[model samples]
Target: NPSLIRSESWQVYEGNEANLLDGDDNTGVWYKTLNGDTSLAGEFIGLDLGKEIKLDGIRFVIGKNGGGSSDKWNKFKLEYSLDNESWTTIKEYDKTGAPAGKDVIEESFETPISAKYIRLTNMENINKWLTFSEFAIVS
Candidate 1:
């Protein structure tokens, strides 16, 4: 099942758009940095899937809109929480590549996670402000 198609309450820890997790891949409606702030490692954006679901994997469209590239997340962790407090890291992405290459990143967990919430914590970045176009969860 596509978790993004399910009814859920999504949130971001740093972005302005609440629809950042609406499953619109490559819409170019990016959730960008605000307040002249540079995104540091461990900063995260999150989503509440509203209920427990078997999460198979996650997908993301990395890079900026048009042609230029800003700070993009290079390394990160996908964590899940059932109670919205204690989180378990379900997957970690450590691939190295040119952020300007416009990569569509995808990773599947070894075991499907039963989770009600998911969060992407940035561990490394290439620029000051990090931006991504889409986020989706495969259930």
Candidate 2:
């Protein structure tokens, strides 16, 4: 199990970001959304896992809190780092299926990586707002 609070810190890379890692998934609420303008094509939310550990899988809950569409993250990528300065792209996502509802999307690595930080990036269209209910990792 992964611990968000025990981790080093969580940050929003761009836009008027807020409520990140707040553990609030209440729909239709501003505090539950990672608000951002459409100026930036993509956004990133990252976390410092505190120390190097074997990361086997990553998971995130994607959906609108209440005031937006259920699907927003059309494309995304998972990255990790040990020194925090340089990052390696671990996985790129582009799944074909029904639009994502309120659900948990999980991605697993072929081999566990020793990492101290992880980042989730939105590479889809320029969405004004991006929101997620939760983000977790499995070691």
Candidate 3:
């Protein structure tokens, strides 16, 4: 039997800002400064996305190391999956023209799609890296 799940909120939190799982756990939701592309290291949605619900779209909040706290770069790609197994490339954007010294930007897209899982792969940039706050699925 298949059930329908609704994704209402979309968020992206990086570094200390990402608060999906307990920061103390530090097992599942994680970000590491690598070369300049720091991304969350973990698996979301254990089931197949296509089998569960339709992926309407996604929203992102890009982070900039220019915050004066951490100096790391982060540009990234958004990936989606159906059935939680195979993944698809939804979007590839960078952290440029973002508030200048702030590197913080917010954007959204509507695909009317159906998938089980979505992933953010950070790449190419300088400073704080990327953080994802929330990810929601709309029925």
Candidate achieving the largest TM-score: 1
Indicate the worst ten consecutive residues by lDDT in candidate 1. Answer: 2-11
**lDDT against the true structure, each candidate:** 0.61, 0.57, 0.39
- lDDT tens digits by residue: candidate 2, 1-139: 3333211222333322233355544432122223344413345555678889998887666654444444355677788888967878887877535464455667887888899888766666553444556666778
TM-scores for all predictions:
0.69, 0.66, 0.47
Q: For candidate 2, what is the total of clashing residue pairs?
A: 3
Q: Give model 3's TM-score versus the native structure.
A: 0.47
Report the Cα lDDT for residue 23, model 2: 56
Model 3 over residues 3-122: C-alpha lDDT tens digits? Answer: 222121212233443333232222222244444442233312112244546655543332233332233234456676665447676766654544533222233555476656665554
Candidate 1 deviant stretches above 4 angstroms: 1-23, 31-36, 95-97, 124-127
For model 2, what is the C-alpha lDDT against the true structure? 0.57
Across residues 19-129, which tens digit of lDDT does each residue of candidate 1 receive?
Answer: 445666544333445435445566776567878888888776665456335546778787888887797887688856654634676778778889888877777743445
Off by over 4 Å in 3: 1-18, 21-51, 64-73, 100-111, 125-130
Worst 10 residues of 3 by lDDT: 1-10
Order of quality (lDDT): 1, 2, 3
Better of 1 and 2 by lDDT: 1
Alpha-carbon RMSD, candidate 1: 5.3
* TM-score ranking, best first: 1, 2, 3
